[PDB]
From Swiss-Prot:
<dbReference type="InterPro" id="IPR030678">
    <property type="entry name" value="Peptide/Ni-bd"/>
</dbReference>
<dbReference type="GO" id="GO:0015833">
    <property type="term" value="P:peptide transport"/>
</dbReference>
<dbReference type="InterPro" id="IPR000914">
    <property type="entry name" value="SBP_5_dom"/>
</dbReference>
<dbReference type="GO" id="GO:0030288">
    <property type="term" value="C:outer membrane-bounded periplasmic space"/>
</dbReference>
<keyword id="KW-0574">Periplasm</keyword>
<dbReference type="GO" id="GO:0043190">
    <property type="term" value="C:ATP-binding cassette (ABC) transporter complex"/>
</dbReference>
<keyword id="KW-0571">Peptide transport</keyword>
<dbReference type="GO" id="GO:0015031">
    <property type="term" value="P:protein transport"/>
</dbReference>
<keyword id="KW-0813">Transport</keyword>
<comment type="subunit">
    <text>The complex is composed of two ATP-binding proteins (OppD and OppF), two transmembrane proteins (OppB and OppC) and a solute-binding protein (OppA).</text>
</comment>
<comment type="function">
    <text>Part of the ABC transporter complex OppABCDF involved in the uptake of oligopeptides, including the cell wall murein tripeptide L-alanyl-gamma-D-glutamyl-meso-diaminopimelate. Plays an important nutritional role and is involved in the recycling of cell wall peptides. Binds peptides containing from two to five amino acid residues regardless of their sequence. Also binds cell wall peptides, such as L-alanyl-gamma-D-glutamyl-meso-diaminopimelate.</text>
</comment>
<keyword id="KW-0732">Signal</keyword>
<dbReference type="InterPro" id="IPR023765">
    <property type="entry name" value="SBP_5_CS"/>
</dbReference>
<protein>
    <recommendedName>
        <fullName>Periplasmic oligopeptide-binding protein OppA</fullName>
    </recommendedName>
</protein>
<dbReference type="GO" id="GO:1904680">
    <property type="term" value="F:peptide transmembrane transporter activity"/>
</dbReference>
<keyword id="KW-1015">Disulfide bond</keyword>
<feature type="disulfide bond">
    <location>
        <begin position="271"/>
        <end position="417"/>
    </location>
</feature>
Length: 517
C-alpha cells in the first residue's frame, strides 16, 4: 500500500471482506471463479500483478522483454521468496506452467496456455506430448523464458491470472490434495493462510518473507463465504464486514444509495451477465429455440426496472468497452420488445412448440438473492412473452460450476469477467476446445475467425475480426446476453486504497489500509 501523506492509520490493521461463496479450492490450477481468484491474489504471485488501478506491473518478474512478441524473457527479482523462506525461482514457474498444461491435473484453466499460444500446448493437452515439452524454460534461477507459436502483442497482460501463478512442487508432491491445508501450504504472495473453516471463514496473515512486505499494511484479512447479498449488506452495516462482495441485493440497493451514498462504490467492470444455454442438448441445439429465448427476454425490464443498479442492457458477450472492442450492435436490439416477442413466438411455433406441448426447461443458478430474484423475473417474462415454462434450481457455487462443465443442464445463469483487458479474454472461451466453454458451443466458423486474429498484425483488422466473431455468436444465439455489469459494492469509509479504477477488480489486500476511526 502507498499510504497518503497525512492519513492517520488505525492501530489495528485487519480487514473483513465478503467473498460470495466457499472457494472451490486454494490450488491455483484447480480454480476458475472470482471468489477463488480474490483469495488467490493475496496468496500466490505470478510474473506480473495488477497495480491499484489495474495496469499490468512487476510481480515476481521485475522486468521483461520480448522478441517479435513471440519469445518473452522475464527477469525475476532476486529477493522473491515463499513463506518458508526459500527463493521463488524460474524453475518454480517452469514446473507450475507444466502442471497447468498436464491433462492429469485436469485444470479448468488448462486452455489459458492456448490463449497465450505457448509452444506445444495443444499436443500437451491432447496427450500426444508430455508436459515437459511446453515452451517454457528457466535460463537460470532468476530468468524465465516463454516461447509462443505466433506473435501475441498483449501476451504479458495474461500473466496476472491465478492460473499462471507458481505453486510449490515440494508441498504438492508430498501432500497431494491436502497441500493447501494451513499446516502444509507454502505461499509467495503478501499473505499466508492462517485458518480455513469451510463455509465459515478463510483467515490470511501477513507473509513476512514477501519481497514487498515493507509496504504491506493490513496484517490480517478474513474472507467470508456469504452468498446472500442481503446478509452481506446486513453484516457490513452491523460493523462485522468492511467490504461486501460485489453482487448487490435488489431488496436493499435503492435504500443504500440514499442512506450511505459515500459507501456505495459503483465502477466500470468488464463482466457480462447472461443466460448460458447448453448448446449440445436438445432442444437447445436448435438455433430457433435459442434465438427465441434471447429475443423474448426483456432487458429494459430486467436491467432498468427490476435491478436498476447502473448495469447496461447487453447485446453481445464481450463488453463493448473492453480495450479493442468495436462491436456492431445487432438490429434486433434496437427493435421494440413487441417486435422481438413476435419473432420469438414465431420461431418456437416453427420449432414445433404449441400451447398443448409448450417449451419447459430448467433454469439453474448459484444460490444468491440477486440471481434468484433475477431468475424469477426472467421466468415470468419468458412465461408472459413467450409461453415457456421454467423450473428454477439453485446449487451452491462449487456444485453449480461442476454441473455446467458436466453439461447436466438446460439453461444456467452465468457471468464472465475478463482475465485480461482484450476481447479474446472473452472470445477464447467460446472456442470449440476451450476448457472454459461451458456453453458447450462448437463452431468451426467462430473458431477460424479467432484463429485469424493473430495471423494479421493489424489492430483494426483484429478488431473487425472480433466484431465478426461476436456477430457469429449472435447469429447462432449461443447465449442470452442480459447486461454488462457495473462493479457495485459497499466499502467502509475507513478502508483506503480501493480506487475502483481497475475494470478487472483485481484487488490485492497488500494495497489496502485502515484509516483511524
Ligand atoms: U489502540
Ligand atoms: U501496444
Ligand atoms: U490499450
Ligand atoms: U431439464
Ligand atoms: U430475500
Ligand atoms: U500493436
Ligand atoms: U474507534
Ligand atoms: U478502538
Amino acid at each position: 500500500a502507498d499510504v497518503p501523506a497525512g492519513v492517520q492509520l488505525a492501530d489495528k490493521q485487519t480487514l473483513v471482506r465478503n467473498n460470495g461463496s466457499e472457494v472451490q479450492s486454494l490450488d491455483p490450477h484447480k480454480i476458475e471463479g472470482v471468489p477463488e481468484s480474490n483469495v488467490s491474489r493475496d496468496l500466490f504471485e505470478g510474473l506480473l500483478i495488477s497495480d491499484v488501478e489495474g495496469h499490468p506491473s512487476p510481480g515476481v518478474a521485475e522486468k521483461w522483454e520480448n522478441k517479435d512478441f513471440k519469445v518473452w524473457t522475464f527477469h525475476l527479482r532476486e529477493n522473491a521468496k515463499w513463506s518458508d523462506g526459500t527463493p521463488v525461482t524460474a524453475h518454480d514457474f517452469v514446473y507450475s506452467w507444466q502442471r497447468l498444461a498436464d491433462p492429469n491435473t485436469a485444470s479448468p484453466y488448462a486452455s489459458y496456455l492456448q490463449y497465450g499460444h505457448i509452444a506445444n500446448i495443444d499436443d500437451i493437452i491432447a496427450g500426444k506430448k508430455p508436459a515437459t515439452d511446453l515452451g517454457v524454460k528457466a535460463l537460470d534461477d532468476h530468468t524465465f523464458e516463454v516461447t509462443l507459436s505466433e506473435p501475441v502483442p498483449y501476451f504479458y497482460k495474461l500473466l496476472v491470472h491465478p492460473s499462471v501463478s507458481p505453486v510449490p512442487k515440494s508441498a504438492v508432491e508430498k501432500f497431494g490434495d491436502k497441500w493447501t491445508q494451513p499446516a502444509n501450504i507454502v505461499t509467495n504472495g503478501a499473505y499466508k493462510l492462517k485458518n480455513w473453516v469451510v463455509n465459515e471463514r478463510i483467515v490470511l496473515e501477513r507473509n513476512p518473507q514477501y519481497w514487498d512486505n515493507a509496504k504491506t499494511v493490513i496484517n490480517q484479512v478474513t474472507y467470508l463465504p456469504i452468498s446472500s447479498e442481503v446478509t452481506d449488506v446486513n453484516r457490513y452495516r452491523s460493523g462485522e464486514i468492511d467490504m461486501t462482495y460485489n453482487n448487490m441485493p435488489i431488496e436493499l440497493f435503492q435504500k443504500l444509495k440514499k442512506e450511505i451514498p459515500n459507501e456505495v462504490r459503483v465502477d466500470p467492470y468488464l463482466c457480462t451477465y447472461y443466460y448460458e444455454i447448453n448448446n449440445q442438448k436438445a432442444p437447445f441445439n436448435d438455433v430457433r429455440v435459442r434465438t427465441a429465448l434471447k429475443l423474448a427476454l426483456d432487458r429494459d425490464i430486467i436491467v432498468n426496472k427490476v435491478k436498476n443498479q447502473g448495469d447496461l442492457p447487453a447485446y453481445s458477450y464481450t463488453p463493448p468497452y473492453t480495450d479493442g472492442a468495436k462491436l456492431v450492435e445487432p438490429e434486433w436490439f434496437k427493435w421494440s420488445q413487441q417486435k422481438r416477442n413476435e419473432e420469438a413466438k414465431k420461431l418456437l411455433a416453427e420449432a414445433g412448440f404449441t400451447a398443448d406441448k409448450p417449451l419447459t426447461f430448467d433454469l439453474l443458478y448459484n444460490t444468491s438473492d440477486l440471481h434468484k430474484k433475477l431468475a424469477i423475473a426472467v421466468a415470468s417474462i419468458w412465461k408472459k412473452n413467450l409461453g415457456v415454462n421454467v423450473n428454477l434450481e439453485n446449487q451452491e457455487w462449487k456444485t453449480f460450476l461442476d454441473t455446467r462443465h458436466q453439461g447436466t443442464f438446460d439453461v444456467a445463469r452465468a457471468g464472465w469477467c475478463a482475465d485480461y483487458n482484450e476481447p479474446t479474454s472473452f472470445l477464447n472461451t467460446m472456442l470449440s476446445d476451450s476448457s472454459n466453454n461451458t456453453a458447450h458451443y462448437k463452431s468451426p466458423a467462430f473458431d477460424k475467425l479467432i484463429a485469424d486474429t493473430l495471423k494479421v498484425a493489424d489492430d483494426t483488422q483484429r478488431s473487425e475480426l472480433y466484431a465478426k466473431a461476436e456477430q457469429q455468436l449472435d447469429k447462432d444465439s449461443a447465449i442470452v446476453p442480459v447486461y454488462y455489469y457495473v462493479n457495485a459494492r459497499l466499502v467502509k469509509p475507513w478502508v483506503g486504497g480501493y480506487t475502483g479504477k481497475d475494470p478487472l477488480d483485481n484487488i490485492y489486500v497488500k494495497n489496502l489500509y485502515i484509516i483511524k476511526h
